[PDB]
Symmetry: C6
Subunit: 188 residues, 6 copies
């Protein structure tokens, strides 16, 4: 399951990480179509050149925030689901017919989840510097003549939800670091 447990997860990996993951899922669900639903259609530019709106939008939004967060959530949830599948497979094999391997697998899964969180946060920072979206953008790309003034839709609400998601991801990273440190200390 999401942020799955393996009989080795501590309190900060069984109680808090699941809560944060569910919170992110719910926020993404309630903001996926309400806020970013009309990101393309409401996006208009101040020009008479045909086809300038689409090229400007693709220039300033290479990949939307909602879909980037969706990919991040899917890739974060993948290792936990893989660990759960492996545990079920091992149980089935034992029934048809070990703790250290499971412990190391869980540690590697937490490490990979932390790595995915960090790389997705870095990608988000690289694509969209800053936490705020501006109402007006200046675009100079073919076929738009010289520079044109395009207007983004709902910058303030998108900024609020971006702050929420970034804070949640930072909390997830901190909790993953704490979980890794606690497991290492307990093992030694």
């Amino acid at each position: 399951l999401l942020s799955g447990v393996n009989r080795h997860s501590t309190a900060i990996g069984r109680v808090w990480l699941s809560v944060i993951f569910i919170f992110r899922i719910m926020v993404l669900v309630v903001a996926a179509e309400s806020v970013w639903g009309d990101e393309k259609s409401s996006f208009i530019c101040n020009t008479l050149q045909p086809g300038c709106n689409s090229v400007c939008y693709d220039q300033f939004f290479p990949i939307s925030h909602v879909r980037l967060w969706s990919l991040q959530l899917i890739l974060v949830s993948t290792p936990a689901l893989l660990v759960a599948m492996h545990v079920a497979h091992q149980q089935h094999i034992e029934k048809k017919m070990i703790s250290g391997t499971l412990w190391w697998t869980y540690v590697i899964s937490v490490v990979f989840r932390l790595l995915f969180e960090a790389v997705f946060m870095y990608v988000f920072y690289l694509l969209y510097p800053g936490y705020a979206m501006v109402r007006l953008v200046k675009c100079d790309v073919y076929p738009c003549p010289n520079t044109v003034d395009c207007f983004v839709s709902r910058p303030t609400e998108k900024t609020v939800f971006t702050v929420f998601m970034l804070a949640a991801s930072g909390i997830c990273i901190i909790l993953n670091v704490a979980e890794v440190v606690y497991l290492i200390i307990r093992a030694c």
Copy 2:
């Protein structure tokens, strides 16, 4: 679960809070897309300047009422879900192998839920003073020249639903205060 119980919840925290939470959930579901569905598209201004509608809408509606209430509900439901997860974890631990800690955790959860309710109500008051929405708004923000007359969509229905949601949240705050007071009195 929503407004969860911990074997320590009284009648005013097990029977009434859950009913109010379900009522708020149902109202938000039946008003999320019906009323606020076309808040952006039906919103039009009396100008010929391109891009003025979007900037005016973002100026007068930094974050929509529906999404603000959704975030409030999610953050209110988070502590109860966390407490339920902790209780399940403790039961699993005891099975694999205490009342005062659970009591204090429940008290802290109720306090945090009350705090979230109060802070969200204060934020709603700060963003949107008053309980009523006007049909006509005067907007003077770039690129709109001087002052322009924008028209809101369905102000009366939104006012009615705002009154409903605010009354429900006030009842929730009162019930949380009563629950905290009753628990403190019973403990002492």
Copy 3:
């Protein structure tokens, strides 16, 4: 549950009220988006003044019929759900460790359901006198100059569904009165 039972509900409160409630729910579901889906967009007025359509629509439809009926259904279903929750709470308390209190609670719940039905019917009568909707409406409200001719969408179908819902609500009121009278007679 909807029009819930408490081991004290008679034949006219266990068999007929539930059927009527389910009938109203199904009618509202099949008419919520099909008929009232384009109540705002198809609504057009005979003027060139920008922003007159929205103000006219808000003037003649302070709150749509579908959402008014939805609120009525939610508030009618609330007392039954509260009674069911209280019964479950009492059963849990007795298991962890009375008929007259349950009987009085059920009577009060039926009374409150009747009161909500009556008040919502009165509100519907006050907002929309008569059972029929006209195709043409004359509106004289700012910014529309003098009087303008607005045209409602699907008045006949909305009239038919209004007749259905009003008849169902009247049957509900009659059955609630009969249930209260029968319980009073049986008790005495």
Copy 4:
């Protein structure tokens, strides 16, 4: 349930009526939004008069075929659900603490279902004489000047689905008559 059974239903009331009801439900589901989805928006008239399209559509389609069939299905399913609820209530009463009364109740339920089928078919015949829909309609109603040429959307597909639904309803009426006759013969 739909076309419910009461331990007294024969082969033509337990096996065939349920199949026909499910067939009608599936046809209505697959034709509700695909065919009649854009009945109002694609409906256009050959005039420059504002507001003529809506009045013409309301004149020629007082209530759409899909919603009429939905109401017919709901009212047909109501007596069976009521009988099932009564049977469950009687079983609960007997457990807490008769065949002829149940038999008469089932007979009355079948009679009422037949009556609803007949009255809805008659209403459909009265509102829409014939089985075919024409592409062109002549409308002379205020505010449209003199006579205007309105164009219906997808008349052929709607005619095909109307034929399907009418044939299914006729089969239902025949089967209900056969069930009543068979029960009367068996009883005597």
Copy 5:
């Protein structure tokens, strides 16, 4: 269930027919709204005559491919559901209180499914000769003056999905013929 079994179905009627039916269901689900969603709105003609688009579309598409395939699937699934209902009824009757009748019923059901498949394929061939859809169509029907050039939307994707569905239906017909032949041979 879909392509149901009756303890008499062989390998080619229990393993392969169900797979083909599920494949057709999934293809229809993934192509119902994605491809044929905007068949009417994207359909435009090269004329200034009002109302010509709708009459041309109804002329060239009497009933859409998606809805024709949906009706075919419903009518194919009907006999299997009827047989399953009859088997359940017989089991209930025996519990309350034969193989040859069930065998003959299954044979008749397979024959009727084959007949429905063949008749629907013939109807599809009669309405739409060939397997390919052309981009341009010449339409000469009132009120369009003389001949007009209408343009179909997504002809290539619709051709691909038509080929898929026709191949699947042909495989279904072949498997039904094989099942009937195998049952006849085994019986004799």
Copy 6:
């Protein structure tokens, strides 16, 4: 089920293939309507010729990426579902009244899944050479006069999702090859 098991599946066919299949399903679900939803409507060309947009779109997108991936996923999942159905049928037959045949069936199923993956990847390469989509396309097809400049919607996001899906399919092909080799080695 998806990438089903047959008691003969190894670790790389029970744990990893299922994870990759679920990842592809989730990516397709979250990108089906968000990215490719307005592929046709937002697609505009720089011409005044009516009907040129639709013919140009059909020329440059014979079948959309989302539906091609959906067909690929359905055809990949078909053999596993068929194998599961056959296993259930064999279990039912044995209950009513072998390992080598099941092993060979599983091997053939894996081979067919690999073949479908390879053929769909080759088809995708043939239809859309390269991994990137360009903003501007030059189209010269009737009725568009000479060459016209059409503009694609969201090329960068579609490129990102294409890279994701192609990488996932390549991983699936590699894992299928490894599974076949491992089974062959273990058998010999």
